[PDB]
Design a protein around this ligand. Sequence first.
Ligand SMILES: [Ba+2]
Ligand SMILES: [Ba+2]
Ligand SMILES: [Ba+2]
Length: 355
Amino acid sequence: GTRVFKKADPNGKLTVYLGKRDFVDHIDLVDPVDGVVLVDPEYLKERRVYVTLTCAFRYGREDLDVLGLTFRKDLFVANVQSFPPAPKPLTRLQERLIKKLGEHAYPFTFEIPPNLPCSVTLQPGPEDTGKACGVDYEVKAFCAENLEEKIHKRNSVRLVIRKVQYAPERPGPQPTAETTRQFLMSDKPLHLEASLDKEIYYHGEPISVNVHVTNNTNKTVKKIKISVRQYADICLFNTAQYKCPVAMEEADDTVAPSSTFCKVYTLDPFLANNREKRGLALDGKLKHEDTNLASSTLLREGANREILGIIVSYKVKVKLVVSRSSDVAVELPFTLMHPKPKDDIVFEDFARQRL
Ligand SMILES: [Ba+2]
Ligand SMILES: [Ba+2]
Ligand SMILES: [Ba+2]
C-alpha cells in the first residue's frame, strides 16, 4: 500500500509524519524530507510550531546526553515555521496527508545538502564504551514562541532519519589488478595477482576475487587467506584509526614450486555475520534490523575531510602463506554502497524494527 511513518510527543499534542525513514544520497542530489505535522490549537494558544533538521557528529557514551561528558558538533541545521505557514510547491504525499488529517495539518520540507556525511555509527565495544561516536540526522518538531527560548525535551518530537549513500556503477573497464612480486630465498620471484569483478558493491552482494599466482620459486604456498577489511578514521573529537575484518576465508589450497595457480574466491561481507565484533562502523544502530555496514565515504575532489566525522573505506586482502614461513599479500580497494530502493494511506510507528 502507501506506507507513512508517524511519531507523537508524550502529551499527544504534536505528531510528525514522514513518508520514508531513509533518504537516499545520490551524488548530485538527495531525497527531499517532505513531512506534515499535526498540531492542537488549544495547546498552541499563543505559540508557533517549528521543525528543525539537524546533522550532528556525536562523541561519547551513546546513552548519555549531558554537558562535559558528551561532545556534539552541528554539521548542518535548518529551521522551518510550520504554523503560521507563510509559504515552494508541495509534494503529492504532503497534500494527501493534509487532506486526510484535516485543517490542523501543516507541511514542512527540508533539502539536505549533498556534501554532508551519511548516517554512520561506530560501536567500539564493552571495554571502551566512551569512544562511541557517529553522525546522526534528527527531525525535531516543537512548540515555541521563537527559536531562541529553551524547549522541554518531552514538549518536542524527535525522529532520527538516515541519509544513505547510493552510487551507480561505472560503464568503464573492469577494476585494475594489483600485483606483487617477492623473492623467498629464490633466484626468481613469487608473483601474486588479485582483482575484483566489480568496482562498486552493494550491501548483501557477494564479492568475487580472482587470484592468480605464478610461483617461480622452490617454496610452496601452504594456505591462501582472503578477507575484506574495514578501515574507519575518526576525525573530529578524538583522532583514531580502526581496522576490522568483516569477512574471512582460509583456503587450504596449495601452490606447488614452479607452478601457476588461478582460482576465483567469493566471500560474503555482511553485517549478519558480524553481530559480535566491535570497533566497527555501521550505517545505523546495532539494535535495528535495517542497519548494515557503513557505506564507503565519498571523498569529493578537494573537499573538507574533517567536517565528515568518520571516513570509512574497504579493501579485499589476499595473503599467501609460504612454507618454511613468510607471507605475500596484496590489497584491493572497492566501494560499498547502499542498494537502490527499487490508493489509501496506512500509518505506522517511525520506530525502526528491533532485532
Ligand atoms: Ba474545528
Ligand atoms: Ba603493487
Ligand atoms: Ba564462499
